[PDB]
Design an enzyme around this catalytic site. Structure first.
Site, PDB file in Angstrom:
ATOM      1  N   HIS A  34      44.916  51.238  56.316  1.00 38.12           N
ATOM      2  CA  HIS A  34      45.120  49.951  56.964  1.00 38.12           C
ATOM      3  C   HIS A  34      44.181  49.788  58.173  1.00 38.12           C
ATOM      4  O   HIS A  34      44.507  49.095  59.146  1.00 38.12           O
ATOM      5  CB  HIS A  34      46.582  49.813  57.414  1.00 38.12           C
ATOM      6  N   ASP A  76      37.861  46.791  49.022  1.00 35.18           N
ATOM      7  CA  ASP A  76      38.174  46.894  47.602  1.00 35.18           C
ATOM      8  C   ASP A  76      38.249  45.492  47.062  1.00 35.18           C
ATOM      9  O   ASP A  76      38.207  44.534  47.825  1.00 35.18           O
ATOM     10  CB  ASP A  76      39.535  47.563  47.378  1.00 35.18           C
ATOM     11  N   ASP A  97      40.376  42.725  45.959  1.00 41.37           N
ATOM     12  CA  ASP A  97      41.795  42.385  45.988  1.00 41.37           C
ATOM     13  C   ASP A  97      42.033  41.192  45.059  1.00 41.37           C
ATOM     14  O   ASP A  97      41.571  40.085  45.328  1.00 41.37           O
ATOM     15  CB  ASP A  97      42.245  42.086  47.427  1.00 41.37           C
ATOM     16  N   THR A 157      52.937  46.702  44.127  1.00 41.88           N
ATOM     17  CA  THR A 157      54.024  46.116  43.351  1.00 41.88           C
ATOM     18  C   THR A 157      53.350  45.249  42.321  1.00 41.88           C
ATOM     19  O   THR A 157      52.757  44.235  42.676  1.00 41.88           O
ATOM     20  CB  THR A 157      54.890  45.179  44.180  1.00 41.88           C
ATOM     21  N   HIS A 182      45.491  47.898  43.619  1.00 40.02           N
ATOM     22  CA  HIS A 182      46.893  47.482  43.634  1.00 40.02           C
ATOM     23  C   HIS A 182      47.102  46.114  42.986  1.00 40.02           C
ATOM     24  O   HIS A 182      46.148  45.390  42.686  1.00 40.02           O
ATOM     25  CB  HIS A 182      47.337  47.417  45.081  1.00 40.02           C
ATOM     26  N   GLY A 183      48.370  45.767  42.796  1.00 42.34           N
ATOM     27  CA  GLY A 183      48.741  44.496  42.198  1.00 42.34           C
ATOM     28  C   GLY A 183      48.139  43.268  42.857  1.00 42.34           C
ATOM     29  O   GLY A 183      47.429  43.357  43.860  1.00 42.34           O
ATOM     30  N   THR A 184      48.452  42.111  42.283  1.00 40.47           N
ATOM     31  CA  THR A 184      47.945  40.820  42.738  1.00 40.47           C
ATOM     32  C   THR A 184      48.528  40.262  44.008  1.00 40.47           C
ATOM     33  O   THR A 184      49.729  40.224  44.173  1.00 40.47           O
ATOM     34  CB  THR A 184      48.170  39.788  41.675  1.00 40.47           C
TER      35      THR A 184
HETATM   36  N1  CMP Z   1      51.282  45.260  45.022  1.00 43.92           N
HETATM   37  C1  CMP Z   1      50.535  44.552  45.850  1.00 43.92           C
HETATM   38  N2  CMP Z   1      49.820  43.499  45.387  1.00 43.92           N
HETATM   39  C2  CMP Z   1      49.059  42.775  46.269  1.00 43.92           C
HETATM   40  N3  CMP Z   1      48.899  42.943  47.595  1.00 43.92           N
HETATM   41  C3  CMP Z   1      49.636  44.023  48.021  1.00 43.92           C
HETATM   42  C4  CMP Z   1      50.459  44.855  47.231  1.00 43.92           C
HETATM   43  N4  CMP Z   1      51.052  45.836  47.978  1.00 43.92           N
HETATM   44  C5  CMP Z   1      50.607  45.594  49.175  1.00 43.92           C
HETATM   45  N5  CMP Z   1      49.744  44.502  49.291  1.00 43.92           N
HETATM   46  C6  CMP Z   1      49.121  44.018  50.564  1.00 43.92           C
HETATM   47  O1  CMP Z   1      47.980  43.171  50.308  1.00 43.92           O
HETATM   48  C7  CMP Z   1      47.318  43.338  51.532  1.00 43.92           C
HETATM   49  C8  CMP Z   1      45.933  42.652  51.703  1.00 43.92           C
HETATM   50  O2  CMP Z   1      44.900  43.407  52.440  1.00 43.92           O
HETATM   51  P1  CMP Z   1      45.089  44.981  53.066  1.00 43.92           P
HETATM   52  O3  CMP Z   1      44.261  45.841  52.148  1.00 43.92           O
HETATM   53  O4  CMP Z   1      44.660  44.906  54.507  1.00 43.92           O
HETATM   54  O5  CMP Z   1      46.659  45.305  52.927  1.00 43.92           O
HETATM   55  C9  CMP Z   1      47.242  44.835  51.674  1.00 43.92           C
HETATM   56  C10 CMP Z   1      48.619  45.173  51.483  1.00 43.92           C
HETATM   57  O6  CMP Z   1      49.309  45.226  52.728  1.00 43.92           O
HETATM   58 MG    MG Z   2      43.107  46.518  49.254  1.00 42.27          MG
END
Ligand code: CMP
Ligand code: MG
Ligand code: CA
Ligand code: CA
Ligand code: CA
Lengths: 735, 146
Positions: free
Chosen positions: A288, A428, A430, A485, A514-516
């Site tokens: 983070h 990454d 997202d 999630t 990670h998820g959407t």
């Molecule tokens: N399963 C998930 N799907 C999407 N976003 C998530 C998920 N779990 C956590 N996030 C949050 O999405 C945020 C967007 O940017 P960060 O990488 O700063 O921190 C990420 C997480 O805090």
């Molecule tokens: Mg991320």
């Protein structure tokens, strides 16, 4: 989009059966060419003069070139065309006949033709050689120097080579032609005149009837959509703000197809666009830290927070470093810190982008050091030469917001564990959401389950069964040890993306961790621009939160793709305590829906915790009780509206039976609003619960017999000491 | 783990039907308290909950007796949402209602050939207020209503 309008349904068939005898002669498509130009044909009774409800002062008669020949006596006219934006043809008919000397209907033909020339093919696409050379058949192609009926005062010029030299000057005179060539082709009488005399214009028109009118009718139709659409820059202009690594975007381009699902991503920092192609790992959930937008570290997640975007906030950093530390402190082995090592290309890049300036050299301990300059006012940087490490230190005249000062050290970036090797971390990909074809989900349910469900009798349960399947295999979202999630197919999709960008040449592992974002319920973020990738291979980058929500409604939602929007949209999200709006249709229809027992109790339960006073107090006053007893009464009526046994009744009754249940509610409500001192907090809610009932009750009316108004229908009732015949009274109120 | 707010309700409702103003509700009352809140335990399933803790007139249950019993079947259930998403799915056009047209439509893509006769059929049995269409409320009813 209905084209013809008939003003006065005054004559008998004589008038009607005359406007028909009129259009049945014009080629269907030539009309579709009209309706496309947003035209509308107006047929009226006896409105000759400027009397039609659309024949007043807009774009009227400017320059006098009017009928076939030239006459300009408006007054006497019966056929007219409002020339300027959206063509409006207006026609009046009087008594029986146009067929004796059809030399009259011809103008409703050319008079029309002036619709499609200048927009037809003569010049929409431009005069294309087609008519540019066909007009040239003034006198050079065929042995028929007969064009007397279209070229006089403006082209009796038999002494001129009419190509591109002089046909532009007067686009108009070559309309008075196409028009007279049209009027002549479709005129119910003189058809061969254009076959005997003009030998080509004829063929020209004929070809057009053969399929030409449909040509343009389909070139204006296609530009019907491509015209007014959602402005999203498609193609590679998006991929520009997309930040995604081209080879990857293109790499993804293939998965969207096979599987058939829109892939939607959030803005990926550009100062990472290459750190990726390069081979740098991507920030997962375990990290983070904040990235950086300056210095050599830029594009990386410094371990030293003060070397990131939050350069100064003596707390974003003081609670920022506090973050990375734990990132390792916990997941040690997977998350760590390694020294910075800007490679060759990268340097030259942060160059023309203007983040660093490579200049004067220096020497220490015997090793070479090219100096890296950055117009910051607290840290001086330097890369090495042997191993391109990088280093910083507080300047001889400055301190760190936390209160530190130091000499040359190696810049540490964050780094996860990739195949047993701490690779550095950059942004990454997202995912903003994943939209799979509503069918692709079926190809998810094991053939027996979806089977054991449809092979069921109960028509109602065969739905519930399905829906739950759709839910269990498509909508459901479980949490996860590593990938946030997300859905199940969402993970499977999440894999194919990573393995796809691997057979391409990536060496940092996965690039989607990670998820959407539509599950980032906790700290949801509102991105304006959103790169999308339709199930075909087109990169589309929206530009608004609206457009984005607009592009999903049009191409995803309402196009058979399973999409679901963030649970925390329209609510305040706990973590960042943010409110992000998103058109929820359910809420759309709330205004006209009678509330539920529980929706009701709930709202009361709320205001309690708000004004610390509930609808009814626990006291001895017997009026408080009254009030209590009363809400327990509405709690019923509402709950009674929504009864499942409303099924053994007929659609008709359902409305009646419910309009009453409704009304009954509006009553005990009307009763308390006119009670003792129920606070205003509740005075308001009830004030509102009424508009609902009302609307709901109004709606249930306009479904069947609608001359009746709630307000009135109410008056006529008697809710005093006997309800018995009151319902009986109600019945008769609708006949 | 019912949220505090999840108590406001389970009481603001629990109490509303506590006629004799004390702090304990009779069986039939519990039955009512719940239904009002949006559930319905079966005629016999209704006892197992009130039965397990007989520290009363062998028939009643207080405030805590209640709140603490809204776990047996409430410390797992999170379906509420899914169903609200399934709704927005069939409600293809975004009017907030699910018309027999779209039912049959989304029904087929998902792979089910439905007869024009047995769709105008579901939509009917699902409709409670008689307006030819199913809103979120009637939908949720139909769905969870076991
Ligand atoms: N399963 C998930 N799907 C999407 N976003 C998530 C998920 N779990 C956590 N996030 C949050 O999405 C945020 C967007 O940017 P960060 O990488 O700063 O921190 C990420 C997480 O805090
Ligand atoms: Mg991320
Ligand atoms: Ca009691
Ligand atoms: Ca609908
Ligand atoms: Ca309905």
């Amino acid at each position: 989009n209905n084209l013809v309008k008939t003003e006065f349904t005054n004559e008998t068939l004589d008038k009607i059966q005359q406007t028909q005898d009129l259009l049945k002669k014009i080629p269907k498509d030539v009309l579709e060419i009209y309706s496309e130009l947003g035209g509308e044909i107006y047929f009226t009774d006896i409105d000759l003069v400027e009397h039609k409800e659309l024949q007043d002062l807009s774009e009227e008669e400017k320059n006098s070139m009017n009928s076939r020949g030239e006459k300009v006596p408006f007054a006497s006219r019966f056929v007219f065309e409002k020339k300027r934006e959206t063509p409006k043809l207006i026609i009046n008919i009087k008594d029986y006949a146009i067929n004796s000397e059809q030399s009259k209907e011809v103008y409703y033909e050319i008079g029309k033709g002036i619709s499609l020339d200048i927009i037809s093919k003569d010049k929409s696409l431009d005069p294309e050689f087609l008519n540019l050379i066909k007009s040239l058949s003034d006198d050079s192609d065929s042995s028929d120097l007969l064009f007397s009926q279209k070229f006089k005062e403006k082209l009796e010029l038999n002494n001129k080579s009419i190509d591109i030299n002089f046909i532009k000057e007067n686009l108009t005179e070559f309309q008075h032609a196409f028009s007279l060539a049209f009027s002549y082709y479709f005129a119910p009488d003189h058809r061969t005149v254009l076959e005997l005399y003009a030998p080509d214009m004829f063929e020209y028109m004929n070809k057009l009837e053969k399929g030409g009118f449909e040509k343009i009718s389909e070139s204006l139709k296609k530009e019907g959509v491509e015209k007014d659409r959602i402005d999203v820059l498609k193609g590679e202009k998006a991929l520009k703000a997309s930040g995604l690594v081209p080879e990857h975007a293109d790499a993804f381009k293939k998965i969207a197809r096979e599987l058939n699902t829109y892939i939607l991503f959030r803005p990926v920092n550009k100062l990472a666009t290459n750190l990726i192609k390069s081979g740098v790992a991507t920030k997962g959930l375990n990290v983070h830290g904040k990235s950086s937008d300056w210095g050599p570290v830029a594009g990386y997640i410094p371990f030293d927070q003060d070397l990131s975007k939050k350069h100064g906030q003596q707390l974003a950093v003081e609670k920022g470093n506090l973050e990375n530390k734990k990132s390792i402190t916990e997941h040690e082995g997977e998350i760590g810190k390694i020294p910075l090592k800007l490679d060759h290309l990268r340097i030259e890049e942060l160059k023309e982008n203007g983040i660093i300036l490579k200049g004067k050299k220096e020497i220490d301990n015997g090793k070479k050091y090219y100096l890296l300059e950055s117009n910051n006012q607290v840290y001086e940087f330097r890369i090495s030469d042997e191993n391109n490490e990088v280093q910083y230190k507080t300047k001889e005249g400055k301190i760190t917001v936390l209160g530190e000062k130091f000499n040359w050290r190696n810049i540490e970036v964050m780094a996860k564990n990739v195949e047993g090797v701490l690779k550095p971390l950059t942004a990454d990909y997202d995912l903003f959401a994943l939209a799979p074809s509503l069918t692709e989900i079926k190809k998810q349910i094991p053939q027996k389950e979806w089977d054991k469900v449809v092979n069921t009798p109960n028509s109602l349960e065969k739905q519930k069964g399905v829906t739950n399947l759709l839910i269990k295999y498509g909508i459901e979202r479980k949490p996860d040890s590593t990938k946030g999630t997300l859905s199940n197919w969402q993970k499977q999709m999440l894999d194919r993306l990573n393995e796809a960008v691997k057979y391409t040449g990536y060496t940092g592992g996965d690039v989607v961790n990670h998820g959407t974002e539509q599950d980032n319920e906790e700290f949801p973020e509102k991105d304006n621009e959103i790169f999308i990738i339709n199930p075909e291979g087109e990169f589309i980058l929206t530009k608004n939160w609206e457009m984005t929500g607009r592009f999903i409604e049009k191409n995803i939602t309402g196009k058979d793709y399973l999409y679901y929007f963030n649970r925390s949209y329209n609510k305040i999200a706990p973590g960042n305590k943010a409110y992000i709006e998103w058109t929820d249709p359910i809420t759309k229809a709330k205004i006209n829906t009678i509330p539920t027992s529980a929706e009701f109790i709930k709202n009361l339960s709320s205001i309690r915790r708000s004004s610390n006073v509930g609808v009814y107090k626990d006291s001895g006053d017997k009026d408080e009780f009254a009030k209590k007893e009363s809400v327990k009464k509405i709690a019923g009526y509402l709950s009674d509206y929504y009864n499942s046994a409303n099924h053994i009744f007929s659609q008709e009754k359902k409305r009646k039976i419910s309009i009453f249940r409704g009304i009954q509610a509006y009553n005990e409500i009307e009763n308390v609003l006119k009670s003792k001192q129920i606070a205003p907090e509740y005075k308001n809610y009830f004030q509102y619960l009424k508009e609902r009932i009302t609307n709901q009750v109004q709606l249930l009316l306009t479904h069947q017999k609608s001359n009746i108004e709630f307000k009135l229908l109410y008056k006529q009732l008697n809710f005093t000491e006997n309800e018995t015949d009151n319902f009986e009274v109600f019945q008769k109120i609708i006949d | 783990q019912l949220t505090e707010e999840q108590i406001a309700e389970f009481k603001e409702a629990f109490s509303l039907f506590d006629k004799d103003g004390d702090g304990t509700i009779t069986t039939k009352e519990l039955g009512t308290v719940m239904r009002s809140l949006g559930q319905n335990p079966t005629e016999a399933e209704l006892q197992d909950m009130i039965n397990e803790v007989d520290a009363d007139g062998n028939g009643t249950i207080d405030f805590p007796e209640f709140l603490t019993m809204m776990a047996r079947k409430m410390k797992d259930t999170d379906s509420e949402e899914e169903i609200r998403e399934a709704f927005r799915v069939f409600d293809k056009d975004g009017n907030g209602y699910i018309s027999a047209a779209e039912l049959r439509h989304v029904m087929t893509n998902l792979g089910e050939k439905l007869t024009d006769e047995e769709v105008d059929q579901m939509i009917r049995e699902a409709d409670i207020d008689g307006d030819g269409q199913v809103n979120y409320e009637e939908f949720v009813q139909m769905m969870t209503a076991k």
